[PDB]
Design an enzyme around this catalytic site. Structure first.
Site: not given
Ligand SMILES: CNS(=O)(=O)c1ccc(OC)c(NC(=O)Cc2n[nH]c(=O)c3ccccc23)c1
Ligand SMILES: CNS(=O)(=O)c1ccc(OC)c(NC(=O)Cc2n[nH]c(=O)c3ccccc23)c1
Ligand SMILES: [Mg+2]
Ligand SMILES: [Mg+2]
Lengths: 450, 450, 458, 450
Positions: C178, C309, C315, C322
């Protein structure tokens, strides 16, 4: 235990049953799901039968004694006094004729208790066909579900999300893009985005109402209105708008489109599917923000209902999955009409009316028992904001574009913060105090909230 | 309206309810759909709690008087005697913990009426967690639905289609491709194709059972089996196999995959979705072949159950739509697990178990009350085959493709057989005898039937 | 721009084009998507026409010099030499007869350049119809995609996941259920689960091959085999299996089912859709475990593949997870398009074949290519933050349970509360409350609080 | 090959390529589909890069000579001169970072040919992020596709269907419900219904434009607008509206919603999916009406493009299936955003732009090459209407139910009109006059048309 007589043989019907032979035959023909019409569908069929009787009486086609009995019996059905008298499976004849006849027979029996004799077909189904009635009751039920139930529930959720967007307007935190550390945002900014998604959800439901509220009544068997008064549809719709207060109900733009297709349900389901997509993003962000406490993000605390498991986010995401599935069933039935009739109406009705109900109920529970009670871990969130990447832009006016660019390059090269790279390059001086550095790079200022 | 006392205080429970405080809290927390567990998932929860008590007793962890009381109570739940004691919504905590606790509380209340005190958690939930029990019950229910109910229902439909294929072996008719007239087939050949679709459906369900029958029991909270005996899983599965006769039930190959994912339900839904695709084709063709009696194809007559409407083809195509929607919901929940637990299990269980139920019931109804009583318009079908422009190709080698095209055009215009048109055009000579004509235009020979 | 004559007028055709009038008519009729057949579908049409010519020659139906010209031309198509000669849209006549005729015309034009006159219909389409060829080529292409490309790529990902499961067998960490803290697992156990999902995915592909490999060839226009040799199907399948090594190809169990329906493609898409569901879970977990590093879970480090970026120059983003999740979404979409076309056949022919072929072959291609890239550019180079993961496991309230039998569940809960409040290890908290004594030695504490033993690793 | 550099070091790039290091890294990272951005997407990226450079120049942030060079390069890209310089797969980083850098690098390389030095990030990406540029380019392309391409294509199809509705206003025929013969309609009325479905489709597309047209530009990395001017977005949107004439382009209502979600693409896809559902019904009916020429319905003849196969209905129903599939992929990506960014943009863009293109192109083809050319079998349609058992009902009050049933049965058996059967059975005189018969059986009056 009693028997009835049908033009194919003998039919045994339960003793306390207001339905008759046609309904009993449908019970024996479709033992498929063991589930029948919902309260909302039964209500809609009663409303429609009362309005039809009223218009047939006004036009002098139906004796006022018979109309009065149909109207009183229909009012009992619309008020939920006979929800146990509709035993036919959802998976019935694709026009919904079986449920239409179930409504006619139950009204005939209720009228007989009051001393009036009605023919289920010739009286209760006067000016109506087996084919324009069930789609009309479906669109009444769907329009009532949209206007009276879903929109107010979404507004309650919007208002809860908007209240947190304001209460957390300066609760700075780290942005996350691709799940990776990004520049600061506020928790209120994020909640302003959730609120917008629900507000756009309400706009999407509103945008479908001109077509969802279109009723086929008056088109009779094929859409031509044969065996109905020419203005039957407009007169019945005016009675329904007056009784329900639902100004969104209207006569079909084209009587053939309104029976050959159920495109209005397909359209509305797309609005509900989009709201399910929005609710999935909101609910997933909220359970991730609540995650942990030691192994997770621990940004907020959810109210405990049952280390709190995010039980309402799980109910929301499960409802969203169901709405996505129901939406596929609706489009499949919608595409597969033929000539003058789409024969997927009972299946399409079950699915859209369930999607309305699930989104209405879970949105109110989410609003009241999750969103309203969230608490922010403000000090933890500020520590995450003070760990986001910085940028050199807010130093330009102090150190110039050239020194700023050299700070940027050296911070990247040495894997240092902007702040420490400025200190290490010996730039604290007349151009820039330590307090000036700290004002320019302030994480709430970088969030551009105030 | 009796009273019970929880952690968080006071909660009223109905007088004749066998559930207790934790179930009643879940009733209050999840008023979403108003639909709870189905009779097959309640049965499975009973079978599982019985088997767990047996094993805890066998391992000397649970007193035998307590294990006997659990086993007797669990058998009543498995036998369907307490379907009204499970009021929790499907849209509950995503592990199914609420329904697991519902089962533990109902067993303790049944045991109490026979004079035995059970603690719901410490005794009925001994060696189990809130996370390996509900998905075990789901996979027991789904395996039993596949083996004991759907496969036999599909075999019944297969055998009805195969019987018509044999009866109609020589019933020659026009093929249709792109909805346009084509060379001859027999109704028998078409029904042999329908029969293969349903036989391949059974193969697809059999092919998913190695993974559908995998059970998580014994993996406890995260899959490691912490706080259960090391052989709890294999012991409980062996008891379930001994009691049910379902040899398809097995301990999972990987205890982590069996709780982090529900990929076995996604896989089985794919088989059900394929059967729905098949049934859509079969049902569509049958309602088109029954279309008429004047302006449609008029190939066959369907038995009249309720202008004889194809009501069972409509039920079948509506069920297929529902299975396709349910399949989309199941995949959506399946994909969205996180780390050690997929928390979409109640929604996935509702959808998979409904898909099994609808296909089982509608397949038997379609076989018995549609397929078995179809009748072919044999003379019409052969006269159209014998009158079709499609069959002039085998005249080309006698009279040339230009005179063959003139025969085709006049036969259609005059609504005559190709045979009669060839005679009327004076082509019978040394060029072509009546016997060579009858050989060339033998439409049943063109269909190449065994 | 040479000109030609169809049985319905004059049509202009590019000069370097090996296609002829029917293909140029199809080009003008279906300007819909601007995408035609893929290399794998063109290859399979070439394999099929070459096998048909071999069989027609063996049966004495086709003159040897005509058969040899077809065989040579069809081999060039199967070898990818003519992938620019198939201009017809995917959204064409639903039997795929336009693409069948494109193949027959291009073979006729190749044979013409070697001095042999082939009639596209009477020679290259001999014993065949406009309805049994395209679905045969579709099922050849899909079977080849499953066996030669997807299963090996899935095996490579399985092996990469399994290798990490072995390397990380003792890397203890807290479970999450959970999204909340749970009892210990190892990162090796979690990766063993991902491996099993991929292995199960290979089992699901294998389970569909007995029906995916069924070919309609020999059934001609309606399934009856009118105007073909009675054994044309088994003879063509024998040649295809011998030349391709695709042992899963076979003649359809029922020649009507094989043309009236494309249920094998719907079945196979379900296996690909299940693989997409598995890869979604795997890729999501991996990007969550790579998240941060400072504001995320920071359990593992993904290999850097490209700058993330310009605003945030340091980053780096989980770009392979993805790609994988975006591919999975495409497979789920494609799966819905395939089921839709599969359901909507009529009588003797399903007329959704080109659309179903595009969707199934694309799902195969995307899963094959993304699985290999995920294995090589992401899984193989992952590194675990071992000390981070062990620190959290050792500080977890979840691990007090094994103290129950020494100090009781109420003192164990108090240890949990104090540890969580004071950010201490359970071990240290047990000490800071003076519970070492007669009931519990310091070695006995270390036995009970052994987090790797609590993961119960094999 | 030549050597290029980025923050991660040195990359070999094809000597002639106009892209640089980051594009080449993406070529190696994502060889997945072998397909890249479409013309419409490259056009939108060029438009946006030019508008950003205009606004940066107007605000004095970018040197006019650099702005001019960017605007000129961006014009060449928008015009399609450099489509071969966009080699990156659709299946790239989920923000579209790679295609954003592809645009920046290609503009820098073009500007260099003209002797102007531009930095791809500092100059061409000034005031921008991928997170706001790639979804802005996607919503520009989708809004253009809706307004300039799809709505006009649907209007052409509506106008062709409406032309038939008028031309066929008195072409009476059998209605069909459940595929069974029903009371009369006209082909014109059926086509009025198809026309309404397409007009409602246009209303569905127009209703989504307030949200489809929302652009993220100005929100930069996380929605806060850090590192851009406060009015960057309002200024860029005004330039794009001026350059495109698309008044539907607007600033996002909420900058966080516009980057954290792509709900507007999910909403628009819903409209496209409903149009696909409508087109499925229309195309199915038309191919069934064209079926035969002997064994089918034979209501109309389709124009021959290749046993005239209904090839354009087949293309339409295959396009519809693809739109439904793409619609599922879009919703799946839409739901799976996290925190400040949805990272499914390239895949959602591929699917929604394809859906727009296929519906645009197939709607124009269907209108021009199928609908416009249909011919009706008028005599056949009327004769079957006049011969159908469905039209005996208005005789019931003159001849009785039993005799109306006998008329219907004899008319079918002899293949005669109902009028001629009533005459043949000797019912004129006793029961009713010829005048009464011709009034009761006028099938065009029964369709309620004139
Ligand atoms: C004659 N009444 S009947 O027997 O009861 C009957 C009923 C239904 C039918 O099709 C559902 C038909 N078909 C036809 O008449 C087929 C046909 N044949 N020849 C033609 O030149 C022609 C021209 C236009 C359209 C169709 C045709 C005939
Ligand atoms: C007469 N040759 S024709 O004109 O070329 C033709 C062509 C196609 C047709 O339906 C596709 C038909 N229909 C019928 O003959 C309809 C029909 N009428 N009356 C009957 O008692 C009957 C019994 C069984 C089945 C159908 C019927 C007729
Ligand atoms: Mg109002
Ligand atoms: Mg942490």
């Amino acid at each position: 235990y009693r028997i009835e007589h049908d033009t194919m043989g003998e039919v045994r019907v339960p003793a306390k049953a207001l339905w008759r032979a046609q309904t009993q035959r449908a019970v024996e023909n479709f033992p498929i799901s063991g589930r029948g019409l919902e309260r909302t569908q039964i209500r809609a069929l009663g409303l429609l039968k009362g309005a039809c009787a009223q218009v047939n009486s006004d036009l002098g086609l139906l004796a006022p004694e018979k109309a009065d009995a149909i109207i009183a019996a229909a009012a009992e059905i619309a008020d939920g006094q006979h929800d146990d008298q509709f035993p036919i499976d959802v998976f019935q004849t694709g026009s919904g004729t079986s449920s239409n006849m179930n409504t006619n027979e139950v009204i005939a029996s209720i009228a007989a208790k009051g001393g009036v004799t009605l023919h289920p077909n010739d009286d209760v189904n006067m000016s109506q066909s087996s084919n324009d009635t069930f789609p009309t009751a479906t669109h009444i039920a769907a329009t009532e579900a949209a206007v009276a139930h879903l929109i107010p529930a979404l507004q309650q959720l919007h208002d809860a999300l908007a209240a947190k967007a304001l209460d957390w307007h300066t609760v700075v935190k780290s942005g996350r893009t691709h799940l990776m550390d990004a520049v600061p945002v506020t928790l209120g900014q994020e909640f302003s985005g959730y609120a917008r998604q629900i507000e756009a959800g309400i706009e999407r439901v509103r945008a479908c109402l001109p077509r969802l509220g279109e009723l086929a009544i008056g088109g009779t068997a094929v859409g031509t209105g044969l065996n109905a008064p020419d203005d039957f549809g407009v007169r019945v719709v005016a009675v329904l708008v007056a009784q329900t207060g639902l100004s969104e109900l209207r006569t079909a733009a084209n009587s053939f489109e309104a029976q050959a297709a159920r495109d209005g349900l397909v359209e509305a389901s797309g609005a509900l599917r989009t709201i399910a997509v929005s609710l999935t993003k909101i609910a997933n962000d909220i359970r991730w923000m609540g995650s942990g406490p030691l192994t997770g993000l621990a940004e907020i605390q959810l109210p405990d209902l049952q280390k709190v498991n995010p039980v309402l986010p799980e109910a929301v995401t499960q409802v969203a999955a169901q709405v996505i599935g129901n939406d596929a069933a609706i489009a499949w039935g919608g595409a597969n009409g033929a000539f003058e009739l789409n024969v997927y109406i009972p299946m399409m009705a079950r699915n859209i009316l369930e999607s309305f109900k699930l989104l209405t109920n879970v949105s109110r529970l989410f609003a009241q028992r999750c969103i309203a009670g969230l608490t922010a871990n403000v000090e933890h969130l500020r520590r995450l904001a003070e760990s986001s990447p910085s940028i050199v832009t807010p130093l330009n006016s102090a150190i110039g574009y050239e020194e700023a660019a050299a700070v940027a390059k050296q911070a990247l090269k040495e894997r240092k913060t902007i702040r420490q790279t400025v200190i290490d390059r010996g730039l604290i001086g007349d151009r820039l105090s330590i307090e000036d550095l700290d004002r320019r790079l302030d994480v709430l200022a970088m969030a551009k909230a105030e």
